[PDB]
Amino acid sequence: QQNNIVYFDLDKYDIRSDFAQMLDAHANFLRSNPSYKVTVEGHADERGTPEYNISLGERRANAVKMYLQGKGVSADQISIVSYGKEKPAVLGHDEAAYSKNRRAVLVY
């Protein structure tokens, strides 16, 4: 959860204002280093079918990709992968765990 994680609200994949700055820092880094590549890994909490979550995780990873592309990062430097609700960051059946799992992580 440090300088590379975007968190989301239940069933949403929009990027909140709160994360724009952290994301701008990554865009600046990638833009000034055209040979660097980053992978955005999207996730979802355990509520709902596996397929619904794979899709929601993809839209979340995609949202980050599009935000970075909106800041001039080349589409070639960014790839996305969705783990659905298959790779949680925290086990547990409550909102404390879930909120920590609805996320997209920039991985180098």
PDB file of C-alpha atoms in Angstrom:
ATOM      1  CA  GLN A   1       0.000   0.000   0.000  1.00  0.00           C
ATOM      2  CA  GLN A   2       2.728   2.690  -0.326  1.00  0.00           C
ATOM      3  CA  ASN A   3       3.495   4.980  -3.247  1.00  0.00           C
ATOM      4  CA  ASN A   4       2.202   2.489  -5.834  1.00  0.00           C
ATOM      5  CA  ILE A   5      -1.357   1.538  -4.928  1.00  0.00           C
ATOM      6  CA  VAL A   6      -4.683   2.918  -6.014  1.00  0.00           C
ATOM      7  CA  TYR A   7      -7.687   2.006  -3.839  1.00  0.00           C
ATOM      8  CA  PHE A   8     -11.298   1.918  -4.996  1.00  0.00           C
ATOM      9  CA  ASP A   9     -14.850   2.020  -3.656  1.00  0.00           C
ATOM     10  CA  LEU A  10     -17.248  -0.928  -3.823  1.00  0.00           C
ATOM     11  CA  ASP A  11     -17.920  -1.763  -7.459  1.00  0.00           C
ATOM     12  CA  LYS A  12     -16.157   1.318  -8.746  1.00  0.00           C
ATOM     13  CA  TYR A  13     -13.090   1.644 -10.959  1.00  0.00           C
ATOM     14  CA  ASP A  14     -12.844   5.415 -11.151  1.00  0.00           C
ATOM     15  CA  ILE A  15      -9.626   7.054  -9.924  1.00  0.00           C
ATOM     16  CA  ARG A  16     -10.317   9.384  -6.955  1.00  0.00           C
ATOM     17  CA  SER A  17      -8.696  12.818  -6.715  1.00  0.00           C
ATOM     18  CA  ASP A  18      -6.696  11.594  -3.741  1.00  0.00           C
ATOM     19  CA  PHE A  19      -4.493   9.395  -5.946  1.00  0.00           C
ATOM     20  CA  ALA A  20      -3.826  11.808  -8.824  1.00  0.00           C
ATOM     21  CA  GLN A  21      -0.624  13.101  -7.313  1.00  0.00           C
ATOM     22  CA  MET A  22       0.914   9.684  -6.610  1.00  0.00           C
ATOM     23  CA  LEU A  23      -0.070   8.692 -10.205  1.00  0.00           C
ATOM     24  CA  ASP A  24       1.446  11.914 -11.613  1.00  0.00           C
ATOM     25  CA  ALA A  25       4.725  10.966  -9.988  1.00  0.00           C
ATOM     26  CA  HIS A  26       4.681   7.634 -11.883  1.00  0.00           C
ATOM     27  CA  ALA A  27       3.699   9.353 -15.158  1.00  0.00           C
ATOM     28  CA  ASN A  28       6.605  11.808 -14.789  1.00  0.00           C
ATOM     29  CA  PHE A  29       9.013   8.910 -14.092  1.00  0.00           C
ATOM     30  CA  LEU A  30       7.843   6.840 -17.129  1.00  0.00           C
ATOM     31  CA  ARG A  31       7.734   9.830 -19.456  1.00  0.00           C
ATOM     32  CA  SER A  32      11.303  10.866 -18.564  1.00  0.00           C
ATOM     33  CA  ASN A  33      12.504   7.240 -18.993  1.00  0.00           C
ATOM     34  CA  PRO A  34      10.970   5.907 -22.232  1.00  0.00           C
ATOM     35  CA  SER A  35      12.645   2.527 -21.839  1.00  0.00           C
ATOM     36  CA  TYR A  36      10.911   1.759 -18.491  1.00  0.00           C
ATOM     37  CA  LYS A  37       7.898  -0.554 -18.308  1.00  0.00           C
ATOM     38  CA  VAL A  38       5.291  -0.918 -15.575  1.00  0.00           C
ATOM     39  CA  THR A  39       2.578  -3.480 -15.012  1.00  0.00           C
ATOM     40  CA  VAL A  40      -0.689  -2.506 -13.366  1.00  0.00           C
ATOM     41  CA  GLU A  41      -2.204  -5.418 -11.455  1.00  0.00           C
ATOM     42  CA  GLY A  42      -5.952  -4.998 -10.766  1.00  0.00           C
ATOM     43  CA  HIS A  43      -7.878  -6.694  -7.934  1.00  0.00           C
ATOM     44  CA  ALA A  44     -11.292  -6.836  -6.252  1.00  0.00           C
ATOM     45  CA  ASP A  45     -12.628  -7.908  -2.814  1.00  0.00           C
ATOM     46  CA  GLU A  46     -14.384 -11.324  -2.535  1.00  0.00           C
ATOM     47  CA  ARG A  47     -18.033 -10.216  -3.126  1.00  0.00           C
ATOM     48  CA  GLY A  48     -19.584 -11.520  -6.343  1.00  0.00           C
ATOM     49  CA  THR A  49     -18.747 -14.172  -8.963  1.00  0.00           C
ATOM     50  CA  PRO A  50     -15.094 -14.775  -9.944  1.00  0.00           C
ATOM     51  CA  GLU A  51     -15.801 -13.557 -13.486  1.00  0.00           C
ATOM     52  CA  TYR A  52     -17.449 -10.353 -12.351  1.00  0.00           C
ATOM     53  CA  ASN A  53     -14.319  -9.686 -10.258  1.00  0.00           C
ATOM     54  CA  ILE A  54     -11.889 -10.533 -13.042  1.00  0.00           C
ATOM     55  CA  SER A  55     -13.698  -7.922 -15.120  1.00  0.00           C
ATOM     56  CA  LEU A  56     -13.801  -5.316 -12.317  1.00  0.00           C
ATOM     57  CA  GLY A  57     -10.080  -5.906 -11.655  1.00  0.00           C
ATOM     58  CA  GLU A  58      -9.386  -5.292 -15.351  1.00  0.00           C
ATOM     59  CA  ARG A  59     -11.316  -1.998 -15.433  1.00  0.00           C
ATOM     60  CA  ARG A  60      -9.387  -0.873 -12.356  1.00  0.00           C
ATOM     61  CA  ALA A  61      -6.005  -1.728 -13.900  1.00  0.00           C
ATOM     62  CA  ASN A  62      -7.258  -0.160 -17.180  1.00  0.00           C
ATOM     63  CA  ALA A  63      -8.299   3.041 -15.362  1.00  0.00           C
ATOM     64  CA  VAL A  64      -4.745   3.468 -14.104  1.00  0.00           C
ATOM     65  CA  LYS A  65      -3.330   2.721 -17.547  1.00  0.00           C
ATOM     66  CA  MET A  66      -5.635   5.351 -19.119  1.00  0.00           C
ATOM     67  CA  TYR A  67      -4.815   7.936 -16.429  1.00  0.00           C
ATOM     68  CA  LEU A  68      -1.079   7.484 -17.142  1.00  0.00           C
ATOM     69  CA  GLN A  69      -1.693   7.621 -20.915  1.00  0.00           C
ATOM     70  CA  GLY A  70      -3.620  10.859 -20.270  1.00  0.00           C
ATOM     71  CA  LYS A  71      -0.387  12.166 -18.804  1.00  0.00           C
ATOM     72  CA  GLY A  72       1.658  11.321 -21.912  1.00  0.00           C
ATOM     73  CA  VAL A  73       3.087   7.882 -20.917  1.00  0.00           C
ATOM     74  CA  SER A  74       3.280   5.687 -24.020  1.00  0.00           C
ATOM     75  CA  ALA A  75       0.781   2.775 -24.205  1.00  0.00           C
ATOM     76  CA  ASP A  76       3.779   0.536 -24.911  1.00  0.00           C
ATOM     77  CA  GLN A  77       5.266   1.160 -21.462  1.00  0.00           C
ATOM     78  CA  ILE A  78       2.147  -0.072 -19.710  1.00  0.00           C
ATOM     79  CA  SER A  79       0.620  -3.500 -19.446  1.00  0.00           C
ATOM     80  CA  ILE A  80      -2.267  -4.642 -17.291  1.00  0.00           C
ATOM     81  CA  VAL A  81      -3.284  -7.862 -15.628  1.00  0.00           C
ATOM     82  CA  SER A  82      -6.411  -8.682 -13.629  1.00  0.00           C
ATOM     83  CA  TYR A  83      -6.269 -11.113 -10.694  1.00  0.00           C
ATOM     84  CA  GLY A  84      -9.964 -10.693  -9.882  1.00  0.00           C
ATOM     85  CA  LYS A  85     -10.586 -11.657  -6.276  1.00  0.00           C
ATOM     86  CA  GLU A  86      -7.945 -14.414  -6.645  1.00  0.00           C
ATOM     87  CA  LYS A  87      -4.962 -12.609  -5.049  1.00  0.00           C
ATOM     88  CA  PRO A  88      -6.143 -10.716  -2.021  1.00  0.00           C
ATOM     89  CA  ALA A  89      -3.732  -8.480  -0.066  1.00  0.00           C
ATOM     90  CA  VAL A  90      -5.667  -9.321   3.153  1.00  0.00           C
ATOM     91  CA  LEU A  91      -7.664 -12.443   4.111  1.00  0.00           C
ATOM     92  CA  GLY A  92     -10.865 -11.824   6.009  1.00  0.00           C
ATOM     93  CA  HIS A  93     -14.571 -11.390   5.588  1.00  0.00           C
ATOM     94  CA  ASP A  94     -15.108  -7.775   6.649  1.00  0.00           C
ATOM     95  CA  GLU A  95     -14.786  -4.243   5.253  1.00  0.00           C
ATOM     96  CA  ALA A  96     -11.384  -3.711   6.848  1.00  0.00           C
ATOM     97  CA  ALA A  97      -9.942  -6.482   4.643  1.00  0.00           C
ATOM     98  CA  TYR A  98     -12.141  -5.711   1.579  1.00  0.00           C
ATOM     99  CA  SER A  99     -11.268  -2.056   1.373  1.00  0.00           C
ATOM    100  CA  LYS A 100      -7.576  -3.072   1.350  1.00  0.00           C
ATOM    101  CA  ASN A 101      -8.240  -5.466  -1.494  1.00  0.00           C
ATOM    102  CA  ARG A 102     -10.177  -3.217  -3.927  1.00  0.00           C
ATOM    103  CA  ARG A 103      -6.987  -1.926  -5.519  1.00  0.00           C
ATOM    104  CA  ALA A 104      -4.650  -1.590  -8.531  1.00  0.00           C
ATOM    105  CA  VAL A 105      -0.877  -1.853  -7.943  1.00  0.00           C
ATOM    106  CA  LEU A 106       1.816  -0.374 -10.153  1.00  0.00           C
ATOM    107  CA  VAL A 107       4.545  -3.040 -10.331  1.00  0.00           C
ATOM    108  CA  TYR A 108       7.993  -2.578 -11.862  1.00  0.00           C
TER     109      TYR A 108
END
